[PDB]
Design a protein around this ligand. Structure first.
Ligand SMILES: CC1=C(S[C@@H]2CN[C@H](C(=O)N(C)C)C2)C(C(=O)O)=N[C@H]1[C@H](C(=O)O)[C@@H](C)O
Ligand SMILES: [Zn+2]
Ligand SMILES: [Zn+2]
Length: 231
């Protein structure tokens, strides 16, 4: 909290020399404030964004913080699946002229989920790794599709050069008691998808997720075992 920095309704936390976690909150009746995490990556003389905030205005505040504190242009953005906490601020990115990327399935689902689709579609090989031709100049971002879990389109990102792997809403923390929203979840494949994420980034010691503070690899293990009980 003390290393933490605030801009508007947003909170920013530095996880690494070139990596920040952005956190936004949405008021949801019945629960109140719900936190959603994303990533900001500085790669040379440009900035890469992983996931939007809940809303356009909150996403706009991300961009202005980046402008004020990092003072580098945002080259691209990648969203991890077609839900509001990750894709709710797509209009703000496009208004700023930022190239946006997402799983082709996410872009296909986006209208059904009330989301604005990304400009470009990512495709993946059978082993889960992104097809390089669909993700040009992603720098240190290593995009990996672990398979159907939280949703059928969820993707994960590793930051090369760091110990950081981003699991999005697929991974819950090691002391969680639930897997959250299983409304659009694949109950049979979730456990294997979680373990595939861990195997894709075997050297990652800091696991960043959407709705919890950065945890260890225990978050991956715990998430898988909770998903085992789904089958
Ligand atoms: C609602 C949001 C949730 S629930 C989230 C899970 N951990 C938080 C929680 O309930 N605690 C353990 C404090 C809230 C999830 C999720 O668990 O993946 N994602 C979003 C929703 C969703 O992706 O299904 C929508 C709003 O994006
Ligand atoms: Zn989701
Ligand atoms: Zn979520």
């Amino acid at each position: 909290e003390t290393g933490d920095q605030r801009f508007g309704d947003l909170v920013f936390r530095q996880l690494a020399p070139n990596v920040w976690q952005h956190t936004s909150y949405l008021d949801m009746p019945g629960f109140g404030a719900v936190a959603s995490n994303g990533l900001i990556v500085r790669d040379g003389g440009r900035v890469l964004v992983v996931d939007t905030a809940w809303t356009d205005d909150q996403t706009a505040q991300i961009l202005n913080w980046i402008k004020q504190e990092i003072n580098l242009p945002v080259a691209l953005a990648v969203v991890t699946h077609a839900h509001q906490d990750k894709m709710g601020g797509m209009d703000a990115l496009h208004a700023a002229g930022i190239a946006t990327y997402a799983n082709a399935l996410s872009n296909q689902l986006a209208p059904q989920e009330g989301m604005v689709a990304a400009q470009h579609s990512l495709t993946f090989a059978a082993n889960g790794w992104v097809e390089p031709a669909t993700a040009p100049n992603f720098g240190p971002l290593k995009v990996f599709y672990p398979g159907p879990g939280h949703t059928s389109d969820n993707i994960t990102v590793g930051i090369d050069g760091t110990d950081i792997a981003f699991g999005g809403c697929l991974i819950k923390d090691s002391k969680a008691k639930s897997l959250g929203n299983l409304g659009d979840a694949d109950t049979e494949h979730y456990a294997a998808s979680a373990r595939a994420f861990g195997a894709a980034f075997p050297k990652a010691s800091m696991i960043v997720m959407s709705h919890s503070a950065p945890d260890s690899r225990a978050a991956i293990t715990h998430t898988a075992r909770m998903a085992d009980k789904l089958r």
